[PDB]
Design a protein around this nucleic acid. Sequence first.
DNA 1: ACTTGCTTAATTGAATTTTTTTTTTTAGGCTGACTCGACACC
DNA 2: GGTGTCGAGTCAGCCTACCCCCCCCCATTCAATTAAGCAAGT
DNA 3: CCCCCCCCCCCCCCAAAAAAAAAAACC
Lengths: 333, 56, 167
Amino acid sequence: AIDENKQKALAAALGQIEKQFGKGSIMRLGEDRSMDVETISTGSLSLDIALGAGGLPMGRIVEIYGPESSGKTTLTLQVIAAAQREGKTCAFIDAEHALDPIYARKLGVDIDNLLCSQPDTGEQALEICDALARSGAVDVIVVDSVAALTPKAEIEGEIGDSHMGLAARMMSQAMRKLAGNLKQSNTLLIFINQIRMKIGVMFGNPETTTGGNALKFYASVRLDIRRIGAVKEGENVVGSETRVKVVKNKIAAPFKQAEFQILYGEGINFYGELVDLGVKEKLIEKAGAWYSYKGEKIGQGKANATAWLKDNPETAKEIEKKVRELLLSNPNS
Amino acid sequence: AARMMSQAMRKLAGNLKQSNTLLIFINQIRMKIGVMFGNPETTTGGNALKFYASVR
Amino acid sequence: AARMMSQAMRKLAGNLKQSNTLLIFINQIRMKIGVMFGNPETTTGGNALKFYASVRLDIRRIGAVKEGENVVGSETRVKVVKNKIAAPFKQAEFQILYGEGINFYGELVDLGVKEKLIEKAGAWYSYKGEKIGQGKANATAWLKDNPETAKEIEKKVRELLLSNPNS
DNA sequence: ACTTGCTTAATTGAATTTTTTTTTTTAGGCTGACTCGACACC
DNA sequence: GGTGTCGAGTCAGCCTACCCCCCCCCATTCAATTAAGCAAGT
DNA sequence: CCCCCCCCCCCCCCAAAAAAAAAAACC
Ligand SMILES: Nc1ncnc2c1ncn2[C@@H]1O[C@H](COP(=O)(O)OP(=O)(O)OP(O)(O)=S)[C@@H](O)[C@H]1O
Ligand SMILES: [Mg+2]
């Protein structure tokens, strides 16, 4: 008796809300396809595993932070390169004024279709982000350094002048405005941030990021990237040994980490990863310092084993297919 | 209230002068809103009393 | 809302006086922003109630009351910010204990010490030589057990500090 | 009977520095900028 | 025929009317220091 | 005895509401 009266009052209210605000304003969460999480590759297989859902989520905000020369720009360009290869449009907002277009081409970016902007102010940078988000025509936006998003008042002003929390306020306002626009357009926004030291602290770590506290809350993923060593061809340093910690994750379990090589002028070493994962999943046998695939000695030393996998495009397909099958915990589709 | 004050001033001003009686009105401040230029402080009971007052 | 409150006061002030009825309005605090003349703490509902009020009390929590670790109440301060029936700007300090209310015996200690009926050496409370406890809580706990001395100290404090007693 | 360490509570001090600017809800005038027709002159 | 220039018309943004009330502001936590009373040693 | 004719003028305001936000090593 009361059941029917409640179901009718509910049905009437739902009808009135959908009339006043629009069609999909309120609905049951189980029958809402908009809310399903879709992901894209990072151009690193170990990082796609660490993220738990096979890559970075569309319609969300991501933060990548780290020290100087850690690989923050190189990593965001490999994301763009991968996205372009699946026929997606990408934008680069270069607030640092430090992008080399020749190096971007060497990492596999289609330069001639990559939208670029070198804005004057933080406001202009973030108004271009909102304009491209509302359009529905851009799939990935990268904002290179939050640290270089200078408010207009600070550019007009003198060096030494105080602007209390003015960048932090700008970023707080930006997040509020963007979150909704990005979810509707299914657009991925990636923010790069720099590290700074906070003083008057003895608990926790003294490392901070720039641009205040809003971005920590709204980010669905946060990556801490670091250079942990060198890659040498005898004497010549030819690349960096890199580590990425997943510091925040809302689309899968956090605190996982990824290890890989960045080689100068190539990018992330995909086959270098595919060796290490093939080893861990018992598909490649490392008998001391001798890498072996089904008895056949593919080489000795990681570089020779990688060079062998490069020469055999069938054996690389085989191992990738198995590793993808096994380790990807939440496959999206 | 503005009308009642308007009518009272008309009636009282002449009766006070004849009898030589001092009449003191106390008023409270309110805040007039939708004013940018100047002082947003008003008093109560309309405009008549400003005109008929010999001292404010 | 400011208009409604302005209209309400006009109507109520006279009706309350005839009936001899006490009306108490509780108000919340809000922040005034921009170009501020004075303190940025405001109250809600416009400017009428400030004029019509015969008494205005500002109440504040100034600390915790702890039984070792367990927080068992609040230390409170009340400022008299407006008064038309006696002189203003006097203040009161008392304890609110959760589930009991205002700690009457705690006030009686503090008023006993002020009017020399109780002797306080460091943190040692003495009534006519006899030592009644160390610390305000043990002193209070004694006065709770000895209602003869409580009634005596109350009667003397009322005689001293309350100017005109009851009818 | 004289002196000292322990007890329990309450009191006071430091905690590196030092800093900003904005709205909706005006009304009516003044400045500068853009549009268009066309008339003088090479 | 085309470009500079005279002229009327229309539109977007700024600013100036304006005096200027305050009576002085919302407040905390850990730990070193002080001290009156009382049991233990002499 | 016999039979109507015609309008005139406004008056007064009332009330506030609300925060937002870090930035940086030094030997
Ligand atoms: N144009 C280039 N040619 C060769 N190597 C490069 C080039 N640009 C960057 N690298 C190297 O790639 C590695 C990572 O560089 P990035 O990806 O630019 O790092 P990053 O964190 O953006 O550092 P910033 O912005 O300069 S603090 C470093 O060892 C660089 O020296
Ligand atoms: Mg960079």
